[PDB]
Amino acid sequence: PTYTPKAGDTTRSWYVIDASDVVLGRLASAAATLLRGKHKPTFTPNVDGGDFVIVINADKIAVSGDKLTKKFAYRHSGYPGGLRKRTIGELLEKHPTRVVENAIIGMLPHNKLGRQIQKKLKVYAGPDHPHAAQQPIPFEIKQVAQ
Amino acid sequence: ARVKRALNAQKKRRTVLKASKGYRGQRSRLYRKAKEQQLHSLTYAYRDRRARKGEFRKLWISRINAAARANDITYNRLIQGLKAAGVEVDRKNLAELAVSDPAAFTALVDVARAALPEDVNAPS
Amino acid sequence: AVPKRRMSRANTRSRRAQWKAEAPGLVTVSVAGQQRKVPRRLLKAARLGLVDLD
Amino acid sequence: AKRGRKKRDRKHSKANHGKRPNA
Amino acid sequence: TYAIVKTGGKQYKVAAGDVVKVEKLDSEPGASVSLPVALVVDGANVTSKADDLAKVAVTAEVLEHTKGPKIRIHKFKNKTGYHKRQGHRQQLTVLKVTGI
RNA sequence: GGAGGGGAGUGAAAGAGUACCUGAAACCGUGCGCUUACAAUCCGUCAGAGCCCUCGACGUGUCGUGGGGUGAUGGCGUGCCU
RNA sequence: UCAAACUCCGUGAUAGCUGGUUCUCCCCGAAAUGCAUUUAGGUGCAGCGUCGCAUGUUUCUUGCCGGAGGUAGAGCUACUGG
RNA sequence: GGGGAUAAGCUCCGUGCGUCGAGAGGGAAACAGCCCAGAUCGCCGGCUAAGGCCCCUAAGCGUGUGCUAAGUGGAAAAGGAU
RNA sequence: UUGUGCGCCGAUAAUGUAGCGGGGCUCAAGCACACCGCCGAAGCCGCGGCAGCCAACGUGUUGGCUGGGUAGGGGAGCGUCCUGCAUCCGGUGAAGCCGCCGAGUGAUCGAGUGGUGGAGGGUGUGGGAGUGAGAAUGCAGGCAUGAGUAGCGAUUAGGCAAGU
């Protein structure tokens, strides 16, 4: 019958993306695709078999509209009146990694497997990374004609 | 004339409670609680028997599409092409090919490339 | 007040497993040529001949 | 107010075709 | 080396020896039966056109007729009083691909 | 200390001991295998990794027209009756 | 325990009222409307269901021909009124 | 169409109009009456409707020509405005 | 100055964003008009098994149509007890109970085998019913959760040595 990956089956890879003025949505959808594993033919939703992702120049992310300063990230401690919010600009100039992370985390399942996937997401505010000893494959986001 | 009722009940009790070895709590000990869960259980089995078809077909399609897109063609146009070419292989088996032998699948991809219309967005 | 439900097997046995006991930490004593095991709290009183050793 | 209006305006969706029960 | 047989309103990937279960065909345990084909593979290349595919046919041996798994149905609806019990085993016919 | 019990005995059998024909379920525990402490579960069902037991064809261990217990993880899913 | 004790008996009092009524499959399959009603939450008959016999397409649908209507609309020095 | 304020998920009538009742499944974020469609049982087979194809969610960050700068899209009036 | 297609302000509530389902989207993933494909249901088709109505034929075969279903009407059946009649097993171990392996479209079944156990049971045809319970703030007995928790019955108050 149909094929189901066993234990000694997975083959991993470390991909690396540039965020040089890429659109956040494109970038995040691509990363979600890769991490969840919708690009290999061995896909199975019960298994995590995607690929590690390394994002760089994440402080170069540029969005459209007034979303830099009219858009409001929110949180809530749980206490009363403990709703506190932030723009996107403030949040870049505080820590840029979180914008791209949360953007991607909303493009994944919020289940156990999703939590076990977020482990496979590494993001760095600069161009660099300590993960050169995996020789990361550059990914260039492309669109297939039909 | 007086008919004690013991046997005639014990029968179905034994049946049910044999069929609920794996359930967790009062669903695994007690007839009035396992009967209900048997109703729900057989029903959910029925429904899943009707729907695992769509489940597997979804799976097969995701595999096919990712394989193709790594060979730089979309799913929709692949199936347009095979329909045009009269090729008969179903999706379970296209997926099996994708897993095992990507070469043959790439050959089929190439067939569809050949057999598609020239101007796909034409008004024909 | 009064409970509302029949609190399950898991929870029941789980909390019930806190009602346990520990053993006193025992220590030898050379009680007149031979040896017996006694807590440390009572060691001197044993060596002086008060503890009822059965 | 709000609740009734959002009901009566969710009805103007596409998969309902302009109508819903209990408005 | 393998092929893809059509039968039962279904399809099955096969090669010689690969035992298979299908719907109830009409034969005796031990007899042989031929079958149509959709795809064939000799190594790397493919036979994918209908004329060649009608010219090729696979041959199989009926090992044994058989009965599938027992399937319990208890249709049910609530506040109503509607139970309906029912059961099923589907008849099968095990094939063994002799050659191609 | 005694209750009570272990041997030795009676007896066809003490899984017949004056709480005694048989001796169910709820219920109460002891061992053996799997599983469970980053997780939101009408408590199941469909797919299913992994481990453990078993039958059989073989070969120094090994897949199978298998079967059974557990079952990570994913999808679906709003108790029973009046 | 008292706006008329308690016990037995009549007595298995009676309730247009509430609840409850146990094994399986196969076929067909509703209604929530009308008149009346010390009557409006009940019931009787007609309505719609099925079973059996009888009558055989009489039912229904589409086309064509024949028939009355005073609705929408429009109209008013064509009446009654503004 | 009446009553009501030409308000009510209001109330009362009509209708070889519908569905629910007694009817699952798909879509509608969840949602008895809405749209599609009326479940003999099985299959790890195919084509379609309503709806939808950036990720979550299977399917198109589809083709062509123009508009939108308002996060309109993804509630709203009288009225105002190069 | 007319008519248009999208737009702006007016716009405004109380647990927490909160009038896209969320991320996010104008480098449209938004509106319109045409075009191409595709996904998608228990729908239709495809391969199989059962069933009801009718019809054709032959000593029960095939075919077409059909098969959601509550109140309810009709039809056909399993099971339990006692029995009339005929036969079968049974201290060389029945029943009953725990099972394992299997079966039936279902109520259910094992004259199929193991353990326990110790004397009645099965089969076919008919007869008759105290004839099938999951619910009645249902009855009787037994046992759980609460729980190894609250309490241990006053406002007088107990103690040390020795004793058996």
Side-chain angles (χ1 to χ4, degrees), chain A residues 60 64 74 77 79-80 90 99 108 115 117 120 134:
Chain A
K60 301 294 189 71
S64 64
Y74 294 102
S77 70
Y79 297 29
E90 294 177 353
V99 187
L108 286 160
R115 287 195 286 284
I117 286 159
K120 307 200 296 283
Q134 296 82 13

Side-chain angles (χ1 to χ4, degrees), chain B residues 56-74:
Chain B
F56 282 113
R57 185 173 165 86
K58 162 178 172 180
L59 182 64
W60 296 339
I61 293 156
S62 297
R63 294 188 175 176
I64 293 159
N65 189 359
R69 285 182 188 269
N71 289 313
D72 194 356
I73 189 172
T74 62

Side-chain angles (χ1 to χ4, degrees), chain A residues 2 26 36 38 64 67 107 141 143 146:
Chain A
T2 305
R26 282 185 167 183
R36 194 185 172 195
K38 297 290 284 291
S64 64
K67 297 191 286 184
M107 296 180 186
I141 296 161
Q143 181 175 357
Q146 75 185 8

Side-chain angles (χ1 to χ4, degrees), chain A residues 47-68:
Chain A
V47 167
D48 55 349
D51 296 329
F52 291 88
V53 171
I54 296 159
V55 186
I56 62 176
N57 290 321
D59 56 356
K60 301 294 189 71
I61 199 76
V63 308
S64 64
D66 298 329
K67 297 191 286 184
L68 194 72

